[PDB]
Amino acid sequence: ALATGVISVAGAFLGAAAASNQWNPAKWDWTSPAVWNGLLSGASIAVSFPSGFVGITRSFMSISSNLVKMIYASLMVGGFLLFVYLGGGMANNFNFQISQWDWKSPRTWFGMI
Amino acid sequence: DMSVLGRHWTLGRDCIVLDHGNTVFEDKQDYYLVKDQMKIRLERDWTKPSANGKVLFNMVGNKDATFEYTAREEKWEVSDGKIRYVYGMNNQGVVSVPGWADWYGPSANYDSKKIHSVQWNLVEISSVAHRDVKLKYTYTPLDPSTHTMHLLSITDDSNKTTIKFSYKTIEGLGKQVSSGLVKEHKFINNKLLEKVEIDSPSTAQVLKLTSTKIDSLYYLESIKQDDDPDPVLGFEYNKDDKLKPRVQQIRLPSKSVVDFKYTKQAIATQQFEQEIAKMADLYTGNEYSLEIEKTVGETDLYVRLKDSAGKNDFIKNQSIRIESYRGFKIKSYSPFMMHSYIAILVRYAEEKEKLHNKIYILNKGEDDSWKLDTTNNNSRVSEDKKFKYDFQEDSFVYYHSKKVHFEYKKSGTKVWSYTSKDIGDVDAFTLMNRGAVYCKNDLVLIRWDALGKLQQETLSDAKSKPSISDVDTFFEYIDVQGTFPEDEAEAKKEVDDYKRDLKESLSDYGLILYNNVVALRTIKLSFTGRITVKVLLYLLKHDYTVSSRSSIELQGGDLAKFNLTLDVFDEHKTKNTNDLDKYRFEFKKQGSKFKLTYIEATDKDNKPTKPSSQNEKLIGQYERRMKIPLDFEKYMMQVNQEGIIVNDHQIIHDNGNFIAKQLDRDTLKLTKFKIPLGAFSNFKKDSDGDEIKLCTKTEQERTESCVSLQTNSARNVSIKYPYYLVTQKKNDIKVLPLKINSRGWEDSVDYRGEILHGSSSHAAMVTTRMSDQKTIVRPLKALNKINKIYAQVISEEKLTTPYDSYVIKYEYEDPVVSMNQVAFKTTIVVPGGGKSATGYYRETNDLQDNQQIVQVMTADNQVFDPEYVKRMNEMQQEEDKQRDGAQLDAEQTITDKSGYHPILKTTPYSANQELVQFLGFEDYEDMTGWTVNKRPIQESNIRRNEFSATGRNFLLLKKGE
Numbered sequence A: 001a002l003a004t005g006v007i008s009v010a011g012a013f014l015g016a017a018a019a020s021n022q023w024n025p026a027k028w029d030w031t032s033p034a035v036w037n038g039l040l041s042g043a044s045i046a047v048s049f050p051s052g053f054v055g056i057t058r059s060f061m062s063i064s065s066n067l068v069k070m071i072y073a074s075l076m077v078g079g080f081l082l083f084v085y086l087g088g089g090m091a092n093n094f095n096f097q098i099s100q101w102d103w104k105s106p107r108t109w110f111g112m113i
Numbered sequence B: 001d002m003s004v005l006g007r008h009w010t011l012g013r014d015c016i017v018l019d020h021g022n023t024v025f026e027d028k029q030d031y032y033l034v035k036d037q038m039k040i041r042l043e044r045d046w047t048k049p050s051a052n053g054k055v056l057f058n059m060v061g062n063k064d065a066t067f068e069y070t071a072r073e074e075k076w077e078v079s080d081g082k083i084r085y086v087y088g089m090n091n092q093g094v095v096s097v098p099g100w101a102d103w104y105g106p107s108a109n110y111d112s113k114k115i116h117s118v119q120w121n122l123v124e125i126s127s128v129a130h131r132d133v134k135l136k137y138t139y140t141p142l143d144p145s146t147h148t149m150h151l152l153s154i155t156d157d158s159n160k161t162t163i164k165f166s167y168k169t170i171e172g173l174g175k176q177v178s179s180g181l182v183k184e185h186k187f188i189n190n191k192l193l194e195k196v197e198i199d200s201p202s203t204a205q206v207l208k209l210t211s212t213k214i215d216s217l218y219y220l221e222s223i224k225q226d227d228d229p230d231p232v233l234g235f236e237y238n239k240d241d242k243l244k245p246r247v248q249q250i251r252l253p254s255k256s257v258v259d260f261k262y263t264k265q266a267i268a269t270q271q272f273e274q275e276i277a278k279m280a281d282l283y284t285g286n287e288y289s290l291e292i293e294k295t296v297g298e299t300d301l302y303v304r305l306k307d308s309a310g311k312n313d314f315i316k317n318q319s320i321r322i323e324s325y326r327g328f329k330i331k332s333y334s335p336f337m338m339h340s341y342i343a344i345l346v347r348y349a350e351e352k353e354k355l356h357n358k359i360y361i362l363n364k365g366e367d368d369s370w371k372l373d374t375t376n377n378n379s380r381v382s383e384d385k386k387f388k389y390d391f392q393e394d395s396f397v398y399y400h401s402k403k404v405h406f407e408y409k410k411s412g413t414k415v416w417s418y419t420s421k422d423i424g425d426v427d428a429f430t431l432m433n434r435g436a437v438y439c440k441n442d443l444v445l446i447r448w449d450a451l452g453k454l455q456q457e458t459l460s461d462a463k464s465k466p467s468i469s470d471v472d473t474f475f476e477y478i479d480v481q482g483t484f485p486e487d488e489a490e491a492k493k494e495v496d497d498y499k500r501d502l503k504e505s506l507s508d509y510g511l512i513l514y515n516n517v518v519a520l521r522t523i524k525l526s527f528t529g530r531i532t533v534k535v536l537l538y539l540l541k542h543d544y545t546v547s548s549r550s551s552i553e554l555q556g557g558d559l560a561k562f563n564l565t566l567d568v569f570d571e572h573k574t575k576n577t578n579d580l581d582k583y584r585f586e587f588k589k590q591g592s593k594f595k596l597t598y599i600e601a602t603d604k605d606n607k608p609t610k611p612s613s614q615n616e617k618l619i620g621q622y623e624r625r626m627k628i629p630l631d632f633e634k635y636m637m638q639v640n641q642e643g644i645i646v647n648d649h650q651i652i653h654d655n656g657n658f659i660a661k662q663l664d665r666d667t668l669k670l671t672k673f674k675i676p677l678g679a680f681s682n683f684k685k686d687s688d689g690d691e692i693k694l695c696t697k698t699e700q701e702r703t704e705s706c707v708s709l710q711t712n713s714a715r716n717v718s719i720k721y722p723y724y725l726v727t728q729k730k731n732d733i734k735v736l737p738l739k740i741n742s743r744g745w746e747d748s749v750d751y752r753g754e755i756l757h758g759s760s761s762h763a764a765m766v767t768t769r770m771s772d773q774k775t776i777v778r779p780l781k782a783l784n785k786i787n788k789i790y791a792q793v794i795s796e797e798k799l800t801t802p803y804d805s806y807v808i809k810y811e812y813e814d815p816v817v818s819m820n821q822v823a824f825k826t827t828i829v830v831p832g833g834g835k836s837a838t839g840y841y842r843e844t845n846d847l848q849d850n851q852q853i854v855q856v857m858t859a860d861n862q863v864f865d866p867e868y869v870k871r872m873n874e875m876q877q878e879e880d881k882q883r884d885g886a887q888l889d890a891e892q893t894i895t896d897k898s899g900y901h902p903i904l905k906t907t908p909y910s911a912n913q914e915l916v917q918f919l920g921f922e923d924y925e926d927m928t929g930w931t932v933n934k935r936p937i938q939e940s941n942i943r944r945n946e947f948s949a950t951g952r953n954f955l956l957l958k959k960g961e
């Protein structure tokens, strides 16, 4: 690149057109910090915030409109009350289904099988 | 990572977490609502800036839920129309770490007085109407050693119900020492859950949790109840894999046992490798991995969507064609792979006279098939030699022909907005996330807001930017001689070419943006032959304004002290190719300028030698061709996560001030180094002559075991830490797989006669065989010496009862691989012990569609009922017709304070009309319209837990009442 001259002069001084140095002149005392930077970038993958996210399986960068009911139900099984209150998911609550169960009235049952 | 229960186990929790990414900019701050194992992004509504101190947040798809964050109070209040959650509440529930208001990144020492808050946990839950009902989570005090805060209690609202948690400390897992030169904040959970108390007006409970210390990690053994002789749930683990043990026996509450049997399935891995054409490559992306090929003699470009392993088993194949622009032979292409869009920069060539650079972008989601954004190519095409680009999830920004184009999507997917402001003199350029830090007379920062508003901030109060002035002076104090002395005019072109080359090389790498500090370096030469580098640092505030300005200076090598020793070949002295002479060259001051001059020559044993007769006249020419020999790559800035590397020095953060510390030259000369890969393994080069090694040291045994990677050089090798290391020696490749969590290395693999590709990645290595010239893609799992991978999976599950037993057996087939995980496409399950007695189910799982098809199979391996899942879903809908129960959320019903339980429903007319009322004097029901003659109802009026007909309380009335 910038220093093709010095390598070309050093390379011309090789015995019978044989590569004896094998990229020696580039590293007599010249540094190589970009390769070192690449090695440090490759070798360093550190997650320095296992405070509250730690132990997570799924995450949503946003809410999908088609999957609204699924994420609402999965929050519902975990006892998170901020969404099923407004979404009308009180039919999905087992305690309400079994408390409204009228004995000797098949219309009120909710038995899956 | 270990939770409070142990490894493999997570206890439920909810909070709001901050992801700043070591920067203070207000756009890059991300907030996440975490509920157990699920996360949702919070998005700032920039259209409504508020001066009360509180900013507003909301989520996609839920505009009916509102978040309000008060910074001065360290509080989030969030609600729907019924229930509000309060997170943080300052010292009650905030995890905060020491960090400055201008620099969130790592430092050498920290300021404990300064602090900033990273996580806000759930402090309180309440109801918008009837605020009496609530729940209060009380947390422990923050731990300064490891910033983890544990849940202590769940306090009562009206009827006393407390749930207290108690914990046990781990003295072993807590970190021993920190070896980082620049230290970052790290979080460690050193406590386990020991016992839970529950005191409620109905019941009382005291539970105790015990754990096993397999190796150096804890796992949940059992839950027991106090005054109960048998464990409620027992867990027993199988350690057939040392690094990852999995539970093989569970004890149920009914005191019946459930066992799982593990088997090691052997699947051949040659099927996962694939061979493809010479002009075809597979570039790995985060979510999707795409392969591009050159079809008709570099004229057009086929794009094909693939998966992590290079197949279409995970992601459906999509064929895209890029047309020739103007019938130009393609020289190079660079793909970039963002969530919503793929952008490929293509470099067309016109006869080496010019190089055009067209940006083809292909935006679609997953449901729709990738296709070209057919947008007017006004600014997505240019031919200039200073063409800078930067692609981001939300936007991208280009610079061609003195113009800064910026395309962004705000509030709309299918259209890109265009914005651009022309800029003038360009000497040193850098593009940030939403703008460009250009070099002018003064240092300026142009940026577009999320609202699209332009913001031009000029960052120069004191003297700055002597870049050009210092460089030309550096150039002119040394006389450099043209290639041929006889013709001055011809050599004037060569000296101009060198001066332009030096200007572009020094300036193009002399403007860095490390996190939120802009660094600009300049270099100059004194009369005395001394080089000084001066780097000016600008710390930027959260609103892209100058927090601070600093200047530090360092020394470069003097030209008088500098010497160059070359081995050189003299054909006129000896015919031996390896009997080389060596020349010493040095700069000597002649007149007013320095001139490089030969000094002396010696043999390869450092005894003086007469130079060759031909070389005695050629040496002057070779000094002219050499021109300026210097380590100029040292002066340019290479930036990493820790600090900025310039002139064998590192610029880092220390107590709010940016300081430069000596970087050892030996590491930068790649002669010796020790790079800590992980917790227990370190990449090590012991000495110069020793080959590249990977030493490891597990915690238990103090024995250093180093594997050798068979490479003397360090430029060949590449590091992809969690998985394989790779090295290219000569025309062969060597691959060293790494065990998970850096517990040691694996068996080395060698591939002869192959050339590595720069597209190789954590997921897959793509190479080119030299004999065939057909490139070969191998997934990470395919890098196995014996050519088979073992996937440990369960064979059967057996339920044992004192009255009967029951065994369900599983087998798996049609594997695929993806990163480090094997998955199976077709699983066969038998419900009984015998398969040939009663048949089975064969479930085929499509990974892309995520729909499974169950074929019920006769004992003679014949399909009795294909798509049996549809039958059961139709059946479920059929039995659901007679039953109806989807009625509570009606405003016509009379409800409680909380609103869970319907007291009274009125069907013909609604509760809004005050035509029907029913008061039962109890805790949960509050009614103010029934004022007693004295004043409204108090505790002294209602008799509690005395004999009523309905409920527990009643009202006692005297004459005056």
Ligand SMILES: *[C@@H]1O[C@H](CO)[C@@H](O[C@@H]2O[C@H](CO)[C@@H](O)[C@H](O)[C@H]2NC(C)=O)[C@H](O)[C@H]1NC(C)=O
Pocket: B711, B712, B713, B715, B716, B728, B729, B730, B731
């Ligand atoms: C480091 O990589 C380079 C290639 O980038 C290797 O140089 C190759 O050496 C082989 C064998 O002598 C030649 O056939 C190739 O022609 C060379 N490179 C190319 C592509 O021209 C070098 O050998 C590697 N270092 C080590 C330790 O072997």
